[PDB]
Amino acid sequence: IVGGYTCAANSIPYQVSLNSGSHFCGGSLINSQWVVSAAHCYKSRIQVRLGEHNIDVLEGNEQFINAAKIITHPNFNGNTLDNDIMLIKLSSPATLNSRVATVSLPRSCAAAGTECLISGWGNTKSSGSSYPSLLQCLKAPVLSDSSCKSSYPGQITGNMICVGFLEGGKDSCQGDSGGPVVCNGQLQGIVSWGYGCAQKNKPGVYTKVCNYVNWIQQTIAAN
Ligand SMILES: OC[C@H]1O[C@@](CO)(O[C@H]2O[C@H](CO)[C@@H](O)[C@H](O)[C@H]2O)[C@@H](O)[C@@H]1O
Ligand SMILES: OC[C@H]1O[C@@](CO)(O[C@H]2O[C@H](CO)[C@@H](O)[C@H](O)[C@H]2O)[C@@H](O)[C@@H]1O
Ligand SMILES: [Ca+2]
Secondary structure, three states: OEOOEEOOOOOOOOEEEEEOOOEEEEEEEEEOOEEEEOHHHOOOOOEEEEOOOEOOOOOOOOEEEEEEEEEEOOOOOOOOOOOOOEEEEEOOOOOOOOOOOOOEOOOOOOOOOOEEEEEEOOOOOOOOOOOOOEOEEEEEEEOOHHHHHHHOOOOOOOOEEEEOOOOOOOEOOOOOOOOEEEEOOEEEEEEEEOOOOOEOOEOEEEEEHHHHHHHHHHHHHHO
16 A cells, blocks of 8 residues: 555454465455455465454464465456456354454445545555555545546456546555455455556556455355
8 A cells, every 4th residue: 555554453354464475465354254355366375364453473363264265256357357356265264353354245336436445565665665564544536437447548347446546646556456445334346456556647446346246145155
């Protein structure tokens, strides 16, 4: 997260860290046994870390749970990042408490102008490599489809939304991918891609979760 602020400890209780030796992507806990993330974060072995604030210190509130099943969207395109969504089934259920909680799936798609909260442990400098220990937070609005497509001509599908600021300076970044965009208590986006980070006229692009509610619910039911 570039240009954000340090979240209050354990104030984003649905945020997880995906770890395969080191932190490499975020995700969101949507029920006690399932996490949603970005398909481009796929790896064959993933450990999910819940209840984290400082990912570099064992604090006492964390749960470390290995993934049992990793399911990417059947229409994920690794070149365009269309359908950049995947589900992780945990090997055992998470213990839900004040520091570990679920986030709701969307009841409708978010309108342009809705303010949302984006969070993660990704890069905090746009070009540098400055990866934080403490979870970062950013408030940003959903942008109109026309603004998103004007920024990324020929690259935005119906499964993508832009969230952020056309003047730059505040954005998600490498390391935040797979993490949550939550608006009015509902998960509306998954951190997916963008040109650089926090550049003028290059807002972040996010997977449009409202298009996938039935797929998520069917997949959980079947697996
Ligand atoms: O990892 C390099 C390369 O991967 C991307 C996604 O394609 O970002 C990934 O890598 C970060 C690892 O630190 C991840 O944490 C982030 O979750 C994930 O998207 C690119 O943005 C980057 O060039
Ligand atoms: O890293 C994002 C960056 O890649 C570009 C192409 O130069 O977009 C392509 O790559 C993205 C990979 O993350 C795809 O998601 C996107 O669909 C495709 O355009 C830049 O436009 C983008 O900023
Ligand atoms: Ca920790």
